[PDB]
Every structure is written in structure tokens, then in C-alpha cells.
Design a binder for this molecule. Structure first.
Ligand SMILES: CC(C)CCC[C@@H](C)[C@H]1CC[C@H]2[C@@H]3CC=C4C[C@@H](OS(=O)(=O)O)CC[C@]4(C)[C@H]3CC[C@]12C
Length: 251
């Protein structure tokens, strides 16, 4: 008892970090180690050309299908975050519409080869050239830059998990009813994140460089929405008849 009281503080941070870590491990589509062992499996030049030969609307549908799969896994992660399921359906929805893509881009770092500038996509590792038919060179370059920048921090699986839970439970998304409860939850997650960050590299204070990325993610997800609305103005029926329903609902 007396010993239990002396540990209660940090024990609680460790407990929450382990909870979130586990939720992350069990809701990622692929194992980190799996992804790292096949970075050499890049598309061959012939396959690259084929993707480049596809029509704009065709490449967009494919990417939306692939992104929707990753989002499905992020929704499973959210469900397991303590507090998320206690919120009103309305706040649950607002946090997912705003954060599900941000968590995807965070998870992208586990499936990104920084030295060669390539991302795991449709079975192989893809250079930015694979996405040329989208007609979004700037948005694509921003995505890869983000991948490179998060990789350069060599975040551990537990670090990625707590950072995912952090930008997901943000109390500043517009239209939230329970700002105070969500805020108290993010604060805990953040103390837990700092706890695990210092466990590995009290060498710096990267928590700030990480929290700095938060603003970059919002701009990245903001551009996605802009590009998508621009695409939907030209291909309204492609979006309506061939885009995945969950992607439509979210974006
Ligand atoms: C306009 C929009 C549709 C274009 C987006 C094109 C690229 C940026 C997308 C398409 C498909 C996306 C991947 C789909 C699937 C995954 C698996 C996911 O793996 S997991 O193990 O972490 O769950 C990590 C993100 C990752 C690598 C995504 C990165 C981002 C990704 C390459």
C-alpha cells in the first residue's frame, strides 16, 4: 500500500502509455519489422509507367481506395482510446473527420524509406513518380517531405502510438461540445508522450519538434481537402459512383 502510494504517479503514466502502445500494435495493418525488410521491393520501371499511363480519375480512385483501407485501421485505434467511446457520437465524429488522415500520415513513417524517398503503396514501395497522374505534384511532394521529416526522428513504435493518440484527441477541432473533457484527456496523453520520449533520448527536447509537426499535419490534411474538392468539381459522378463510402463520409 505505502509502496503503491509512492509509485501511483509515474505508474499511471506508464499504464496509459502501455495501453495506447498496445492499441497501436493491434490496429496497424502491418508490422514495423515486416515493412522495414521489404523497402527494396520498389515498383519496376514498367509498373511505374503503367501508373503514369492511368487517367487522372483512375489514379485518384485507386489512392482513395488504398487510403480508405488505412483509415479503417485508424478508426479501430480510436475505439480503443480510453475516453473516446465516452464522448457523444457528435464529438467522436468531429475528431475522426479531422484526425483520421493525420494519424494515417503519422503511421506513414513506419512504411516510408527515407534514404530512397519511397512509400509503401499497392504492394510495393513507390517514388513520387508513381503518383504523377494525380495531377498534384506539390501535395505529393509535401507528403513525401513530411514522411522524410518524421523518419529523421527515428520514433519508436510507442512514440508513434502516443503521438497518434495526441493529435487525435485534440480539443481545438471546430464544433466540439465537450472541449473541457477532451482537453483533460489530451493533457494526460501528452504527459505520457513526454514520459516515453525522455525514456530514450533525454538527449534533446524533441517533444517540441514533434508538437511542431502537429501544425504541419493540419496543413497537409487541409491541402488534401482542397485537392479533393477541386477534383470533385470536374468528376462529380466518379466520386459519387466509384469512391469508397467511408472516404465520401469523411471528406
Ligand atoms: C488524393 C489522395 C487520395 C492521394 C494520397 C496518395 C498517397 C499519399 C497515399 C495513398 C495510399 C496511402 C497509404 C495506404 C496504406 C498505408 C498503410 C499504413 O500501414 S499501417 O501498418 O501503419 O496501418 C501506413 C500508411 C500507408 C503507407 C498510406 C500512406 C499514404 C498513401 C501512400
Amino acid at each position: 500500500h505505502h509502496l503503491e502510494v509512492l509509485f501511483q504517479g509515474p505508474a499511471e503514466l506508464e499504464h496509459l502509455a502501455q495501453n495506447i502502445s498496445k492499441s497501436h500494435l493491434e490496429t496497424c495493418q502491418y508490422l514495423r519489422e515486416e515493412l522495414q525488410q521489404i523497402t527494396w521491393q520498389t515498383f519496376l520501371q514498367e509498373e511505374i509507367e503503367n501508373y503514369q499511363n492511368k487517367q487522372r480519375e483512375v489514379m485518384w480512385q485507386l489512392c482513395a481506395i488504398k487510403i480508405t483501407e488505412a483509415i479503417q485501421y485508424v478508426v479501430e485505434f480510436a475505439k480503443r482510446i480510453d475516453g473516446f467511446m465516452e464522448l457523444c457520437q457528435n464529438d467522436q465524429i468531429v475528431l475522426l473527420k479531422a484526425g483520421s488522415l493525420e494519424v494515417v500520415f503519422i503511421r506513414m513513417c513506419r512504411a516510408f524509406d527515407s534514404q530512397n524517398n519511397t512509400v509503401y503503396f499497392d504492394g510495393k514501395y513507390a517514388s513520387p513518380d508513381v503518383f504523377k497522374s494525380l495531377g498534384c505534384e506539390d501535395f505529393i511532394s509535401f507528403v513525401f517531405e513530411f514522411g522524410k521529416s518524421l523518419c529523421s526522428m527515428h520514433l519508436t513504435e510507442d512514440e508513434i502510438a502516443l503521438f497518434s493518440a495526441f493529435v487525435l484527441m485534440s480539443a481545438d477541432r471546430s464544433w466540439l461540445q465537450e472541449k473541457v473533457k477532451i482537453e483533460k484527456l489530451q493533457q494526460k496523453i501528452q504527459l505520457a508522450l513526454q514520459h516515453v520520449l525522455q525514456k530514450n533520448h533525454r538527449e534533446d527536447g524533441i517533444l517540441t519538434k514533434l508538437i511542431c509537426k502537429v501544425s504541419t499535419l493540419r496543413a497537409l490534411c487541409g491541402r488534401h481537402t482542397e485537392k479533393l474538392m477541386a477534383f470533385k468539381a470536374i468528376y462529380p459522378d466518379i466520386v459519387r459512383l466509384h469512391f469508397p463510402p467511408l472516404y465520401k463520409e469523411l471528406f
